[PDB]
């Protein structure tokens, strides 16, 4: 499996999105809301905790093997292109880093 990951990362440019010169990158988004926190009417804001998932296609990361799926923690998240998704109306947003990312 290490060979597969090394081959995928070999000759990979994470600065460029997939289909950079072909078509828009289609991303399918999912949300699971754990809790909509208290609504601060004084500040006009509300806290919300979510599991945010994004699915897209990157033909650069194609691999032919019997594994059929590589399940990985955050370690390679910085090694590939990730969407630039941000929340437009978020006064403050934080990711979680305990125990690990």
């Amino acid at each position: 499996v290490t060979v597969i990951l090394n081959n995928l990362l070999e000759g990979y440019d994470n600065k460029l999105r997939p289909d950079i010169g072909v078509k828009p990158t289609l991303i399918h988004t999912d949300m699971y809301v754990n809790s909509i926190g208290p609504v601060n009417a004084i500040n006009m804001e509300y806290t919300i905790d979510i599991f945010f998932a994004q699915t897209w296609y990157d033909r650069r990361l194609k691999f032919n093997s019997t594994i059929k799926v590589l399940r990985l923690n955050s370690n390679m998240v910085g090694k590939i292109w990730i969407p630039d998704t941000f929340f437009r109306n978020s006064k403050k947003a934080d990711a979680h880093w305990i125990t690990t990312p």
């Binding site: 499996v1 290490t2 990951l5 208290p38 594994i67 990985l72 923690n73 370690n75 390679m76 125990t99």
Partner: protein, 58 residues
């Protein structure tokens, strides 16, 4: 000493932390233990509570 240094240096040669132990062979079993040093204050205004823990995983 020399034996200690060579053991430490050569331990991770050819090691991939991206993969869990026993990937494709078995299920990784983790034994968990918690020692609550101090059950922190419970915040009614937040539905929140703090707890200081020594968290052990084997």
């Amino acid at each position: 000493t020399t034996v200690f240094t060579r053991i430490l240096d050569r331990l991770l040669d050819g090691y991939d932390n991206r993969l869990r132990p026993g990937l494709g062979e078995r299920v990784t079993e983790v034994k968990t233990d918690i020692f609550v040093t101090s059950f922190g204050p419970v915040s009614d205004h937040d539905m929140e509570y703090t707890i200081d823990v020594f968290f052990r995983q084997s």
